[model samples]
Each structure stands twice: as structure tokens, then as C-alpha cells.
Target: HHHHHHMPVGVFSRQILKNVPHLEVFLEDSVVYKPKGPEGLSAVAGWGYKSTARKAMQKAREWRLPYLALEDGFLRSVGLGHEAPPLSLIVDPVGIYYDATRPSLLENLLNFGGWETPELMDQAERALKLIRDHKISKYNRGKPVPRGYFTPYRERVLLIDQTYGDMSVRLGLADEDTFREMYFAALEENPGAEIYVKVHPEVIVGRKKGYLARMKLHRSVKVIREEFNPVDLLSHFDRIYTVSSQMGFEGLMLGKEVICFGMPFYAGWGLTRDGKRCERRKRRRTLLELFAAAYLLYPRYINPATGKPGNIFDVINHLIG
Candidate 1:
């Protein structure tokens, strides 16, 4: 009892065909505005942040077809990667991704069960190794640091700033208060140290604004507004702090100690010093295992050029390219 003429699902975009010229299969305006699929023929409501996408999703639900909610994943491609021609995505069939901290379908999948495996660990290593070797990053902030270009100082710490009201920051753990909290915490813990606060790339590029001046800083706390990549700066710092940022995860890749003020997807896996806890994540995983779950097992990817499905490895290679 699973026959739906032909199409199962298609991507929803406003200028979808215009943006993705090679989109072999896309839902046109008519189809999205009026879905005529047979029973059970669903459509994917894409990149859910935009208003048009929300309209398409409502139409799909009213039509009574089960569709996938697609959103970008964390380990995505180069440069301020919020929605940069996405290289990785999560096709959540269970339900819409509510938030990171609460137990969503993907979070439950990552946290529950003994999903870890040596093969996955190997994949994580391979992915990390590729990123480290190629000097690739979320965005091309700058070339990777030359080995020994940095020397760690125990008293030096970095606080990663997120754009105010960012979804990850609001949902992960604490709110904008994290900026003030982590700042004072750094000064209190590493007094007399030249602590650095790295601003978000989106803010640096003017894509978004941040709370740099919103939180007053002592002279000891220096604000970093440059385009330096987080990965490059890790080797030079003793510890890093964030409410919830991928920068902290990147730091972990380099063996730098990271503290989390929010319950990011990467936190609570026994990897970070967590300010808030997700009791649902009972399993303690190694860095590789956590990466494996978050990056490898969670999402599907497609090369932007060919529109062909690719794995984490292929995405990394594409980013490096």
C-alpha cells in the first residue's frame, strides 16, 4: 500500500531552479503552491530558516503527505557556513529539528544506544586528519597555522563569541549572558593572563552583528576581531570557552582543552568542561567517537557542482578544493 505515482519527494526553494540550475529534481512554484502528489508522496521542506520555506512546509502538512525536514548540519563547507550552498544536511524524517540541547530525533539518535564503532572512529580520524592537513575550515579565515607557529601558555584562554540570539547559543545552553559569564570566568580563573575573545566570523564579515562591546572587557581581556580561523588559534591557547560553538569542537581536534557554557551537540560526551549538562547523553565517548556520531552518522551530503551524493570524506575534499 505504498504507491504514489512516481515522485517521493523534492527540494523546496523560492528561486530553487534559478539557484540550482542542475537540480535534476525540484518542486516548482505550482507543485509547492499546490501539491498534487498521490497519497504518501511527500516533499522535502528545505533550509527552514526562510519564510518561503515555512509556507511550503505548511502546504505539505495540510496536504497530509509525510515529508522530510531538511536542515544544514554542523560540519558543513567553507566560509561563514550558515547556509553557504550547503555541503551537508540532515534529512530528519522523525520530526522537525527542534533544538540542539533538547532531545530531538537526531540528538536522540546520537546519544542513545551503543552506536559507536571502530570503523566510525576511523572515519572520524580520517576526516580530522584531512581537515588538519589541508588547512580547510568552516570558512577560509586564513591559511592553517604552520606547525610550531604557536606555543601554548597555560594561563592564556580564548572565549568564542556568538552572534546575539543565534539559534545554537539560544538553544544550546545559556544565552547572551554567556559572554559576560565566560569573560569574568576567564579573568577569575586565568588572572594576569592575556585572555582573548574571538568574535564570530559572521559578525566579522558583516553577515551578522555581535555583542563585542555589549559585554565590557577588562584590559587583560583582548577582543579578536580579525579573520583568523579558530583551528589555527587553538595550538596557541591553553583552554577555550564557548556557550556552544563548533570552534570548541575544532579545538578538541587539536587536543586543546575546551569548556562549554551551553549543551552543544559536542558537549556532554565526556569531551568538554560543560557548564550545563544534558542528562540524556549518558554515554561517554572519546573525541573520535563523538565526531563520528555528529559528523559521520547524522547527515547526508551532496557535492554542489555535480549534485551527486557524497560522504563526509567527499565533503571535506570538496571544501579543501
Candidate 2:
């Protein structure tokens, strides 16, 4: 009896949930207030970290029902999420993975099994290879890095910028100062090296503001507004810096020196050089094991072409092919 009803609180959430499969979702003006039969209403579901989700969670609490959070996956889609629906999504029964303020399902997954499963680790390793080999990333729509993109400096560093007001920063136990700290660190640590600040895609499209908007540009610093495939861009960089961007995780997979300013899900996993720490993530996990938990054990995927259930590897195939 998997017949569960989800009351998506806000109207904004409807579009995000439309593409999601295997859920009987109902939208309502939760702000105005209303609900349904207790047995039929399994949970209150909403997009992760958005205002709609905030409303949904509050409604769930008042109704004494569980809250489910959904967000775009690390390997999302070939285009911007605002422009196209995500091919992969992470639905958490507990909390959103990006929020380090509370224990998330992703953290629980990392803390639990699949660590000793050699076969699962092997599959994760293979999936990582496929992703790296094909230059797949969260947002796969990016032009090829032009020849000599990194020609200016032998030692290239990339500073990832996130969209302004992204809840991941605050919820990940970081603030504006964290981005500032990371930016300055990138400059001071990589002296005489070429520094490129990669702006968020939403900023480039004029849809949202970027955290690095006020950063002072210098001869050594270059702001990259163009959307270049993260794998292609990461391959050219010697070091990658991020506050909580998934690019940091991708950089780790690419074997680049990753410096994380915030406690992203991938941080504190004995992989990246974390500027922040999470006491809960104690087990030093191998790269393959971490990948197994996040990519293999977590997140739900679908074939965008078919709109049916799919696996992580399938999404990579869809991107490359």
C-alpha cells in the first residue's frame, strides 16, 4: 500500500513536482491553511530550501505529519534547472542534504552501511569514471573550454561562486564571511597564480544575484561568466575552492586539490581540505565509499527522454550521448 498523498504547500512547488514520478501530489494554499484525511495524507512534500518548502514544513509540523524535502541531484541535467527539469533528484525523508544545520538523510547514508561493500564501491568507482570521462556535471549544459583557457598561468586556481540567497550557505553553517574568507584565501595562498572566479549560471542568465558580485577584480583575478562544463574547467585548474557548491565535490572526483570553505556533504570525508568541520562526520571514508553513499546509495534518477525510473549511470549516458 504505497498510496501516499503529498500536500505540496505552495503553488511554486507544483512545477518542480510535476516531473517527479510515483507520487500522488496535491497543491494547496497552505498559507491560507487546509489539509485532508489523516490516513490518505502520508506527508507534506516540497522543493528543498525554497520558501515553498518552508511553508510545507511548517504545515507538516502543525498537522503532525512528516516532511519530505526534494532537491536537484549532484548530476542534475544538461541545462539550467530553471530552464529545464532536472533528470535526477534527491528526495530526503528527514532533511535536505545541503543543510548541515541538522542531520540529513545523506549524512545518515554516509554514516551507515555501503562503506564495507566492495561491490558497491566498485560500482561507484565505475560511475565516477564515466562522469569524469564524459565531462558530466550538475548542470551539464556548458560550452567546451576554449583552447588556451588556462594558458595565462601554469598554476591555475578556481573560486566557485554560488547564487546569492542560496540556503545551502547558511544552512551549511556558513555565511557571507565564509565566501569572503575563501576568496581572500584563494588569492593569498595562490600568490602569482591565475585565479578564476566561476559565477553561478543563474547570475549569468540574469535570473539571480551571485555572491561574488562585489568582488574587486584585478589583473590576477578573472571572472568567468561563461558556462563551461565543470569537468572541462576543473581539468584545467590545479586547485578548486568553494563554499558549498557541488563543483567542489566534482573537483574531488577529478582528483583536483579541493578546498571547501563550508561543510558541504562531501567535506569532512577525508577527501577535501575543509575550512569548516562537522563533528558528526567522523569516519574517514575512502573516495569510492563516499561516492557510493552520495551517488549510488542516495538520490533518485529518471530518464528524461522516457520520464521513467532510471539510475545515476543512466543520467551520465544521457548527458554524454
Candidate 3:
């Protein structure tokens, strides 16, 4: 019964439309296997934000379809850039929004036992090295961070900002308290250390702006104005903080000390310094277990060239190539 106005239409989801395994995909429903039903093989119509997409999810629940919201792989290889389609997608019952409706892959892995092991850690390191070496990112086309910044390192700390009112922010701490408290915490912890507030690009150009450049903490913290890829700026800072910016997760990949102001997909699970926590995640894990669950095992990706499901290395090589 929710009204969804955006479906990430056009080039954003065209790759999905082109690669769906369903023999038929109907914008109006029931173009594939007579749609969701009790008697025969049923299929999900389209995975999207369209009203039909929501209804499809609902119908699956009522009628009990065999398949659910299966998408491509994680570290989704496509950029937000319009030139190319998604390099891969992860098919999952629930993608990693970390919502309560269905079990998110991240949460499932965190709750599951036996993920912490040397083998998984080695896999995690391999995954990190692969992505880091290639400089691949979620939304890759931005320029590198400008120079003459962080001039001298005196206990450097970074407070990552997010688009105001984005779901990440709402879901993380879900409020404005951490929005400013993190700044004060930075100065309190480091005293005279240089602090940089990297503003989200959407807020810089898009409507949601403020909280990053406010007065009060002006002298202690410097607002970063450069449009650099977060991966580029991540290694420069000694510590990073965020409500739920994916950058915080990426920062973890770099071994940067990340303090979470709100719970993110990577928070809890004994990996991050979580401000609020999900009680279910009492398990302690190595970084590899966390990364492997989130990146390797969660999402299902399709090889653009072959229209077949591919592994993480396959997607990585394709994107890098």
C-alpha cells in the first residue's frame, strides 16, 4: 500500500531488465510463468521501487513463490555513471539495507557461527587487495582529493557526512544528535588534532546541505571541499566517523579506525565501534568474516558478456578490465 515514485528507471536498471533470468518480465505483472501462484512454477515480475515491485513482494508472501528478491553480487560492479550497466548484481532474499522486514545478508552472516577463521580472513584480505589495487568504488567517476589539505598529521580524524535525511542517516543513528556530537567528540578525543569533515557530494550540489559547515566547531574542524573519491581520502585519515555512510564501511576495508555514530551494515558484530547496536550481533569475528559475508556470499552477479551468474573475482576482473 506504499506509494513509490522512483524505480531508478532508464539506464540505472536497464542492465537488470536485460539480464533477468525470467523468460518474461512484465511491467504490469504475470508475463513470466503465470506470475506468483500456488499451483505452478511462479516468478517475480520485476525487482524495483515501482509500485508493482512492492506488490510483487507482497504477492510472493501471500502466494508463496519459489523465488524472491534475488539481485546480482555485492560491491555491485557498476558505477552510478550512465555509460555502462551494472557489472554484476547479487541475488538475495533481502539485499543489505539492514531493514527489519527480512533478514539482511549482513545480519545473517553476523549471526551465523563459524565465519571467523584464517581462511575467511585470507579471503577478506584478498578481496580488499583486489578492490583497493584497482581503485574500484561504488560510484567511481569523481576526481581525487585535492592537495594542500591535512597539511600536517597531528592525530588526524575524519567525520564523514551524508546526504541529509537519506535512508542511511535515518537508519543509522536516525537523528541529528550524532550529526554534531561526533564533531565535539572528535575535538574532545584529540584536543588540538586537525579534524576534517568530508561532506557528501549530494549535499554539496543537491538540496540537503548544512550540519557540516555550521559555526561553533568552526575553529577546530575543517570542512573538506574537494570532490574526491572516498577511497582516495580514506587512507589519509587516521580515524573516521559516520552515522552510516558506506564510506565508513570502506574505511574499515582500509584498516582505518571507524567509530559508528549509528548502526550500519558493518556495525555491531564486534567489528566496529557501534554507538547503537543490534542485540542479535553478539558474535566476535575477524574482518575477513565480515567482508566475505557482505561481499562474497551475499549478492549474485551476472556476467554482462555471458548473461550468466559470476563470482566476485569474475565481476572484479570484468569491471577492472
Candidate 4:
């Protein structure tokens, strides 16, 4: 189990408490206050007791007096003495800590690198458009399309990797043998499935070696070497699959089927596969849930410095940088 120090408890904390049963304690003294009510400090004191009751009461006395006294006195007189505070005027200098070993919304935000800004979002859109318009014909002018020509299969799979050399190792999902088996299994399931494996833009610019060797594998798999637009390709795919690739979220946004192999933060909240022994066979989720989680629940804003939301385009610029 992982432990976190100074962890902020908010809407996310309530969600975790409702879902998981592992005991959690508020160690450092902190104040838990409900929004002021119509009584102007005379608001009902029992409303905040639903999910935050225990922790809130443990912290009642540590709160600012005016807020605590108004709320705690009412609660205490009713035999809820545990809800009263010591009324210490000094701020308790509280430190928020939590058991981080289990999954929590904080971890999800951390994985997304906190909130993204609007400027970053625009930059990403522009970069993607540029990649989409990149010309592959320049290299293969008048050349007959190779057997199993990839161009005819416009559907693309964007596997965001930190680097190209490392991507194969990561996408391989383990050793060479495992990748080969996965490839064969996928082929067996959908003989016509065109798998376009694109290297992470960062890896391509880094001048990493072995791109050709990586591409020279099964006839069914094609390695795309140019900067490509993932959003444009989204319209071409019947389904998208990844092992925690943020691109999967993009695919879902574009109304494509997303299949996740790993336990991404987006997974297991009734969106992606549960990966349980019994759940392994069932794959189902309403598109509404996907939209709510990816677009609404997860806040996306522009980065003040770059003026873009965190997206594949940002990854491309970071790669070039």
C-alpha cells in the first residue's frame, strides 16, 4: 500500500470513500466546513455528515472558530459531542495525508500531469493537422503500392510512446515472444485488420536506431515513419486498442471502439475492461459514460506557457524540443 502526505481531500476523497472499504483516518488536524446556509452561520449542521462525517468530525475543533463554533455547538448539543472542537484559535497547521496504496482520483490527475491549459490545446490541434497533411507519396512516387498496401487501409492506431526504440519494447508488452503471440492472435481474430504501428514522434526525432528492423515484421503490420494525424485517422478505424495509451481516450472522443489491455486510470470505472477473470470475457460500456469521463469530468485547459491542452500535439512539440 502506498501512503501520501499532505493529500488534499475533496470531491475525489468522497468518491474513494464511497467505493473502497480500506480504512482511512485523518491524522493531522484540519478543518472541514460545509458551504454557508441561508441562516448566515445558522445553516443546518447535519448535511455534511454523509460521506465526510467521520473525518469532518475528527477535524471539527481544528477549524476557524466562527465557522466551527457555529456548526459544532449545534451538533454537540444534540449528543454529537464527537462533532465539537477544542475551539483553539490558532490554525492547527494541519497536514493532509492519505493511504495512497489504492486507486484514487488524485492518482488519475497525477497521471494526466494535472490540468492542461487552453493554449496547449490549440497547439495540439495545429500540430495534428500538419501531420495529417504530410505527404507519403513524395517518397513512393509512381511506385506500385506494396503487397498489403497500408494506404488503402486509412484506419490508424496511435500508440503514443516516449521513444521509438523503447516503444517496440513497451508495445511488445513484454518479450519478443509475447508480442509475436499477440500479433498472431489479433491477426487470427481479424484477418483483414490493418495494424499501423507508428513510432512515438519523440523517438523519431531523437534519431534512435532500428526503425527499419522494427517495421520488417509480419506482413499484416505496417510501420508508419512520418508524422501522422491521429484525429484524422480516428474517422477511419473500426476499433482502437492500447495498453494505457492516452490515444485511446482520443479514439473514444471520436466515437471509435477503444480496447484497453492495462488498468488505465480511465479503466474500471465502468468504462474499459475490468480485467477480472470473469470480466475478461465481457466488454461493454455506454458511450455516454465515456464522453462524461473523458470530456466533462476530466478538466482540460490551455497551458499558459504553450497555449495548448495536454494532447498528442503537445507530445509532438515536446518531442521536437
Q: Give the TM-score of candidate 2.
A: 0.88
Q: What's the TM-score of each model vs. the native?
A: 0.81, 0.88, 0.75, 0.40
Runs with alpha carbons beyond 4 Å of true place in candidate 1: 1-40, 43-67, 81-84, 95-98, 143-154
Who is ahead in TM-score, 1 or 3? 1
Highest-lDDT candidate: 2
Lowest summed lDDT window (length 10), candidate 3 = 5-14
Off by over 4 Å in 3: 1-57, 64-74, 81-83, 100-102, 113-123, 204-220
Worst 10 residues of 1 by lDDT: 24-33
Return the lDDT, model 3, position 274: 75
**Model 4 segments more than 4 A misplaced:** 1-101, 106-181, 207-216, 273-321
Predicted candidate 2 versus true structure: per-residue lDDT over 101-217, tens digit per residue: 778888987776645576777788789888878888888788899997667648778899998888888877899878888888888997878788998888888999888866776
Please give the distance, in angstroms, between residue 189's alpha carbon in candidate 1 and its true position after superposition: 1.4
**Off by more than 4 A, model 2:** 1-13, 18-34, 37-39, 114-116
Estimate candidate 2's alpha-carbon lDDT, on a 0 to 1 scale.
0.76
Winner of 2 and 4 under TM-score? 2
**Best model number under TM-score:** 2
- Order the numbered candidates by TM-score, best leading: 2, 1, 3, 4
| Residues 139-216 of candidate 1: C-alpha lDDT, one tens digit per residue | 654555456543454457788887765767776767877778877887788776778888887787787778654466
lDDT of 3 by residue, 1-321 (tens): 385332211111233455543312212123333232445433343354445556666666666653344443346544542345555554444444544233565677677755667776676678779889877676665577667755755567888887655555655545766788777777788876778888876565655665665435676567876777778888788689888877887888888888988877788767788778677666776677777777776655555557665567776777677
Task: Please report, in order, the local distance difference test score of every candidate based on alpha carbons.
Answer: 0.67, 0.76, 0.63, 0.36
